[PDB]
Design a protein around this ligand. Sequence first.
Ligand SMILES: CN[C@H]1C[C@@H](N)[C@H](O)[C@@H](O[C@@H]2O[C@H](CO)[C@H](O)[C@@H]3O[C@@]4(O[C@@H]([C@@H](N)CO)[C@H](O)[C@@H](O)[C@H]4O)O[C@@H]23)[C@@H]1O
Ligand SMILES: [Mg+2]
Ligand SMILES: [Mg+2]
Ligand SMILES: [Mg+2]
Ligand SMILES: [Mg+2]
Ligand SMILES: [Mg+2]
Ligand SMILES: [Mg+2]
Ligand SMILES: [Mg+2]
Ligand SMILES: [Mg+2]
Ligand SMILES: [Mg+2]
Ligand SMILES: [Mg+2]
Ligand SMILES: [Mg+2]
Ligand SMILES: [Mg+2]
Lengths: 119, 73, 101, 88
Amino acid sequence: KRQVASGRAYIHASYNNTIVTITDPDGNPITWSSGGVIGYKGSRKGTPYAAQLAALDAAKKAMAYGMQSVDVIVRGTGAGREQAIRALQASGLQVKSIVDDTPVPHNGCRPKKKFRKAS
Amino acid sequence: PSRKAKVKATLGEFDLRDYRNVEVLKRFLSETGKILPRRRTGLSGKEQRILAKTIKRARILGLLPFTEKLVRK
Amino acid sequence: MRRYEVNIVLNPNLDQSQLALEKEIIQRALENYGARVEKVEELGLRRLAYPIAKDPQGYFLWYQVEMPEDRVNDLARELRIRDNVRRVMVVKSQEPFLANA
Amino acid sequence: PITKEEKQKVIQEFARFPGDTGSTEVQVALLTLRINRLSEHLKVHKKDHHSHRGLLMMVGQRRRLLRYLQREDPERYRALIEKLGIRG
RNA sequence: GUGGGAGAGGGUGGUGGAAUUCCCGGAGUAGCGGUGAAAUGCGCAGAUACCGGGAGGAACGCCGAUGGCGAAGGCAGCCACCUGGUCCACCCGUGACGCUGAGGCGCGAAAGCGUGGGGAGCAAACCGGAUUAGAUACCCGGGUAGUCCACGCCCUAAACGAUGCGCGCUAGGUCUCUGGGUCUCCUGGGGGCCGAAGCUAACGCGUUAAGCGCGCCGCCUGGGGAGUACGGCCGCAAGGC
RNA sequence: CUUUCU
Ligand SMILES: CN[C@H]1C[C@@H](N)[C@H](O)[C@@H](O[C@@H]2O[C@H](CO)[C@H](O)[C@@H]3O[C@@]4(O[C@@H]([C@@H](N)CO)[C@H](O)[C@@H](O)[C@H]4O)O[C@@H]23)[C@@H]1O
Ligand SMILES: [Mg+2]
Ligand SMILES: [Mg+2]
Ligand SMILES: [Mg+2]
Ligand SMILES: [Mg+2]
Ligand SMILES: [Mg+2]
Ligand SMILES: [Mg+2]
Ligand SMILES: [Mg+2]
Ligand SMILES: [Mg+2]
Ligand SMILES: [Mg+2]
Ligand SMILES: [Mg+2]
Ligand SMILES: [Mg+2]
Ligand SMILES: [Mg+2]
């Protein structure tokens, strides 16, 4: 209930789950979806299938605010990233563009043991 | 392949020590503020090595980018 | 002495008076430290690759000096004091190493 | 550092004859010069151990040249020492 | 000596952006996270995902190498000052001034110790979840010392090329870093590979020798007991020799 | 995932 149309679609994909946050032309989120948003509770959450149902929901919910034109901003490689992008490309929303914006440090903090053994 | 034609080739003689020719320097960065590898920059050990310091100076001066977003994907 | 290059970037929002003022202190400051100007370039405004102090543009200055090396570091402590001066960078001068020439 | 002046100013000041660029008096002279600047630099930067080695090296090279001197001509020696200001 | 060169060699100061954490503001709801599955955990005092602002600590992406520098330990954002080593050309100066080096003095990763400071992330110990027959572990969630800085102590290591230093002599080929030249190659220094002669138990080494010789130092003398006992020296202690 | 002994 605002009417936006033109806006941004943020896809935050990770190997543990995918979450889509649709927002306005300058940041403030309108509606968000995720693996949890929809049924899927644990492992199933990550799956590229959910990455779809999530994108769609995000858009559907976003269609209510009267969305249309959207700019997709992917963040992080993970189980079903490209899938979210495709979902949006369908749905209804017109995908103006897509852009990898995943963050990478210029070597700042020591990662958890989990992600070490690099160099 | 990576043979999209060297960057040194498509370019006339220029001072590599000059950290303000944003026009020319801009040339050695990819679709991001990343300094191109020798096998693209077409430079040489010594050259390449100086370029890299020249490009860093710029960035600090704000003339050149540290990193860009990737369009497409 | 030695030959250096002083790069100075300040607030792109300076009216003829404010701007011409900062240069007053710079010109002054240089002297006060032994900086002997050999020449200058004033490119002025340029679209920065990224924002500097929220501002997306910058006003550039370029002075090539000859001064007591043992005071180059102090000369720039001074230069950075100013609030409109958001970036100062001194550099030892060097032969323009060519390439592809 | 040591300007070319700073340097040559010493070389002439010790050279055994016009053109003497590397006699023993000269060499001991230039070394005493570097050793002083360096030991001066280390008065501060005590943690700069790396540069310290270079000192030990010069200090060696020096007494080793003096040793040879005081052996060949005991006179030029006492001359050189009192002059440069070595021993103490 | 004169003239040049490359370099993450070292020390002090300054400074740049990426990211993480925290705090403030907005917009926004019901989950986020995490695994092999999960759970602990965090979330309606509104978390996660998104935007803007701030603070702080630590490290320094691409360049970056199969690269470089140092005697080793080791050293990489940028800038300036201070400073060590080292290479090439000219062959100008001294005139054997050389080599090695018991002891000595100094240096010496990490962990560790003492006083003070700092503390974002990571994380011995520890507190929990899970897995398991059990789990004092691996996996997951927290987390203290510590990791950071200063000053002082510690002195060890697969401190490795597991290969002491110096010099002379003995096919080449190829790639590379750096200097000089008459610069499609010659010549000097350095890093790699293949390989003559030769060496080796074999593996392999081979002008960067592990080949042929000379000089000086350190060291070995079956495995275990044992780097232990004892004694002495050093150390605040742990411990070291 | 772990997944002992002979
Ligand atoms: C001689 N003194 C002891 C030494 C022990 N370390 C050993 O485990 C004992 O017993 C047997 O030892 C053998 C060599 O060490 C071995 O490996 C046998 O496997 C064993 O088989 C099973 C028993 N059912 C039979 O002893 C159990 O899993 C364990 O004891 C297991 O070590 O016995 C083991 C043995 O008696
Ligand atoms: Mg030097
Ligand atoms: Mg001669
Ligand atoms: Mg003679
Ligand atoms: Mg130590
Ligand atoms: Mg330590
Ligand atoms: Mg302590
Ligand atoms: Mg843990
Ligand atoms: Mg933790
Ligand atoms: Mg060679
Ligand atoms: Mg043979
Ligand atoms: Mg071989
Ligand atoms: Mg005691």
